[PDB]
Design goal:
The structure is cut from a larger assembly and holds four copies of chain A and one copy of chain C (142 residues).
Chain A: H1 4-13, H2 15-24, H3 40-50, H4 57-71
Chain C: H1 3-6, H2 8-14, H3 24-34, H4 40-50, H5 60-71, H6 75-87, H7 97-107, H8 113-123, H9 133-141
Classes of the chains: A mainly alpha (72), C mainly alpha (142).
Subcellular location (chain C): Cytoplasm, Cytoskeleton, Spindle; Cytoplasm, Cytoskeleton, Spindle pole; Cytoplasm, Cytoskeleton, Microtubule organizing center, Centrosome; Cell projection, Cilium, Flagellum
Binding site for Ca(2+) 1 (chain C): 15, 17, 19, 21, 26
Modified residues (N6,N6,N6-trimethyllysine) (chain C): 110
């Protein structure tokens, strides 16, 4: 392992190398990024529920609107 | 080390309402920075004028 | 909701025989112990007032409605609580992502799964794929 | 509230701190209400409030009548005991050991 | 105990938590704030003085 700060310093020092490094070094997995997925059991449950089955929309409508606004 | 620290400050995190909502990573971070002091009877901690830094 | 479950001790204390049915005699005895001697008619009337079934007695479920009536929570609390209830289809103090999706579907406002996940993440702090009451309140206030 | 007040002395013999213990006399004394769903509801609420006295100390009392003569008084007797137990005086004193026992580190 | 700087850093790192912490953590006593009060003996003395001039 290598501490980011030190690495950054090194990169700054060797400017021509930095670009090359960037080009080359593909991380096998970024710990920053989220992965979007569902579990199969949950899906099954949802499906099961599907076969079974407006006034309180206004307290939540506002929230939805806010969310939408945030999105942009 | 982090785990050990967490264990040490279990009396803090479990009792107080502040840290019940706190995340695990956050807790870990906190634990590292938490000292612990065993003050004697009649042994004052903060004195009038001293810097409140903790 | 939570503290109403801790009330059961009182109910137990009230019941002398231990049948889950508050008799008039027991009530009378309790009153006597306290240091007040009202008539049995009054007791009967009281019983009639609160109980639903009306079989010279009442259970804890019967009491529950009365307790609820007594409570009188805050307006914001009432609103927020209602919202929470609507969200949580099962009713276990926690709202899953699937549940949220279902509620959205029911409502009509359609969104992507990724978006929903993001929203959940924003809501949550401790990181357990779920949201508490406190956490929920974070979004409504600010 | 049954408010049992007590003044605390000092190691220099002077009064410095106060104590005041409380206890619920809602169901025991008399019923009054500003707003309520019913009388029964009010009574229930009172009962809920006054659990510490009526639940654990006065637990032989709910069968036998006239609790104001013995039960409430008895409960107050805890406070009375406290009056003695609230004379430690807030003094930086030695560790209290019972008589007929010798210390581990004595001469 | 926890040093303020470290705590501050932690709070900055965990932004969503900070607000929650603020909401929750009520200090039993702030060492910053003054308390306004008079002593009883002093009051008595003042009262005594009152009758003289």
């Amino acid at each position: 392992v290598i501490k980011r700060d030190a690495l950054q310093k090194v990169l700054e020092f060797y400017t021509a190398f930095s670009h090359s490094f960037s080009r080359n070094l593909i991380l096998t997995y970024n710990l920053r990024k989220r992965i979007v997925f569902r579990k199969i059991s949950d899906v099954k449950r949802e499906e099961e529920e599907r076969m079974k089955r407006l006034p309180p929309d206004h307290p939540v409508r506002r929230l939805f609107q806010r969310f939408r606004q945030q999105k942009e | 080390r982090a785990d050990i620290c967490v264990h040490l400050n279990r009396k803090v995190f479990k009792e107080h309402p502040a840290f019940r909502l706190a995340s695990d990573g956050c807790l870990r971070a906190l634990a590292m920075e938490f000292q612990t002091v065993h003050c004697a009877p009649g042994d004052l901690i903060y004195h009038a004028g001293e810097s409140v830094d903790s | 909701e939570e503290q109403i479950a801790e009330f059961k001790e009182a109910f137990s204390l009230f019941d002398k025989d231990g049948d889950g049915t508050i008799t008039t005699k027991e009530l009378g005895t309790v009153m006597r112990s306290l240091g007040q001697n009202p008539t049995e008619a009054e007791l009967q009337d009281m019983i009639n007032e609160v109980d639903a079934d009306g079989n010279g007695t009442i259970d804890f479920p019967e009491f529950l409605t009365m307790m609820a009536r007594k409570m009188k929570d805050t307006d914001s609390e009432e609103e927020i609580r209602e919202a929470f209830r609507v969200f949580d289809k099962d009713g276990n103090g926690y709202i899953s992502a699937a549940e949220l999706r279902h509620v959205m579907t029911n409502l009509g406002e359609k969104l992507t799964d990724e978006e929903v996940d993001e929203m959940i993440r924003e809501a949550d702090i401790d990181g357990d794929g779920q949201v508490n009451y406190e956490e929920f309140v974070q979004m409504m206030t600010a | 509230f049954f408010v049992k007040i007590a003044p605390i002395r000092n190691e220099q013999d002077k009064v410095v701190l106060f104590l005041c213990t409380f206890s619920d006399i809602t169901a025991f004394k008399q019923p009054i209400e500003d707003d309520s769903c019913k009388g029964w509801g009010k009574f229930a609420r009172l009962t809920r409030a006054l659990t510490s006295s009526r639940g654990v100390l006065q637990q032989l009392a709910p069968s036998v009548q006239k609790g104001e003569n013995v039960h409430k008084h008895s409960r107050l007797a805890e406070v009375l005991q406290l009056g003695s137990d609230i004379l430690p005086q807030y003094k930086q004193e030695a560790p209290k050991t019972p008589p007929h026992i010798i210390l581990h580190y004595c001469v």
